[PDB]
Design a protein around this ligand. Structure first.
Ligand code: BEF
Ligand SMILES: [Mg+2]
Length: 335
């Protein structure tokens, strides 16, 4: 019973998931207090001091964002984990502005991730993991926007190694032209045992808002992709729709600019690469063919009409990617 002595307020209006969280936390030893909505949560906070809050957004009489606004105006600094089915990017941006430890988008696929995140909240000295650092990026968002040097340093520290194994696939890159240190930013991330996604961003076009956008995208890219596949009940994503959601996130986060981006996803069981570009030039070479990708127009404007997705079958590929910020070659092999 690791969580004995620790108090958790669960603010959730839907019965199945609230009972699920209540049972799971109680089995681990936590004292759980249940709130139907934001008003009920405030009344319960009149007589409970939680060590952690789990908070849904969409709720009848007060949504979780107004509850968060009230507790943070009162100077309460209790950690909050947001767990919400919301597809509204304004909600995620407002949650980040108000100060939260993390934002999980329902459905929660594996309980181990939520377990480690709760444990990072309730015992931060103990669970100083990668999850700790993700939550650190989530809660320090205001501190990041108010200090450009820290944001640039963090973005450079998050640039992945040039040689990796992700989802049983071999992934390399090389910067070829980088006159800017945070120039062409890259993220590559596993989604399951057998598929991965990646993004390459050009922060130099937009200046400082590029850097912040990169940080925000690193916090949330997987979460937005996973959610799409869960909510639309699909294995293979619709990356254009994802990038439209990314547009709405960067706009609602008050990060105006032009953000040249390429996003992709690979499934090794299906041997299936999917690519789409908003603003960056790219040439793919799959072993059998060379495919030149239409660069489209950058994110940061609404109405992007050129988010047309390209699918290719391959066991391995190399993509040259470039824009005004510089040049790199990203390389994958499924064997
Ligand atoms: F009702 Be919650 F925001 F999923
Ligand atoms: Mg709800």
């Amino acid at each position: 019973q690791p969580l004995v002595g620790k108090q958790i307020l669960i603010v959730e209006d839907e019965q199945v998931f609230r009972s699920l969280l209540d049972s799971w936390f109680s089995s681990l030893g936590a004292t759980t207090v249940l709130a139907a909505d934001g008003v009920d949560a405030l009344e319960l906070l009149g007589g409970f001091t939680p060590d952690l809050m789990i908070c849904d957004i969409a709720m009848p009489r007060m949504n979780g964002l107004k509850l968060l606004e009230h507790i943070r105006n009162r100077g309460d600094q209790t950690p909050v984990l947001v767990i919400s089915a919301t597809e509204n990017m304004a909600d995620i941006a407002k949650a980040l502005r108000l100060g939260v430890e993390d934002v999980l988008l329902k459905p929660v696929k594996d309980l181990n991730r939520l377990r480690e995140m709760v444990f990072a909240c309730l015992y931060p000295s103990m669970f100083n993991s990668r999850v700790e650092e993700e939550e650190r990026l989530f809660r320090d968002w205001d501190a990041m926007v108010d200090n450009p040097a820290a944001a640039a340093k963090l973005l450079q520290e998050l640039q992945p190694p040039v040689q990796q194994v992700i989802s049983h696939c071999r992934v390399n890159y090389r910067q070829l032209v980088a006159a800017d240190k945070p120039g062409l930013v890259l993220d590559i991330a596993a989604l399951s045992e057998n598929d991965l996604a990646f993004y390459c961003l050009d922060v130099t076009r937009a200046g400082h808002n590029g850097v912040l956008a990169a940080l925000l995208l690193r916090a949330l890219f997987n979460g937005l992709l996973q959610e799409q596949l869960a909510h639309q009940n699909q294995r293979l994503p619709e990356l254009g729709a994802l990038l439209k959601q990314v547009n709405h996130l960067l706009r609602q986060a008050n990060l105006p600019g032009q953000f040249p981006l390429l996003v992709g996803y690979y499934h090794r069981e299906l041997k299936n690469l999917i690519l789409v570009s908003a603003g960056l030039n790219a040439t793919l070479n799959t072993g059998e063919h060379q495919v030149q990708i239409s660069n489209g127009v950058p994110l940061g404007t609404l109405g992007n009409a050129y988010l047309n997705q390209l699918s290719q079958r391959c066991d391995a590929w190399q993509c040259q990617i470039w824009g005004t910020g510089g040049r790199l070659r990203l390389m994958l092999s499924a064997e």
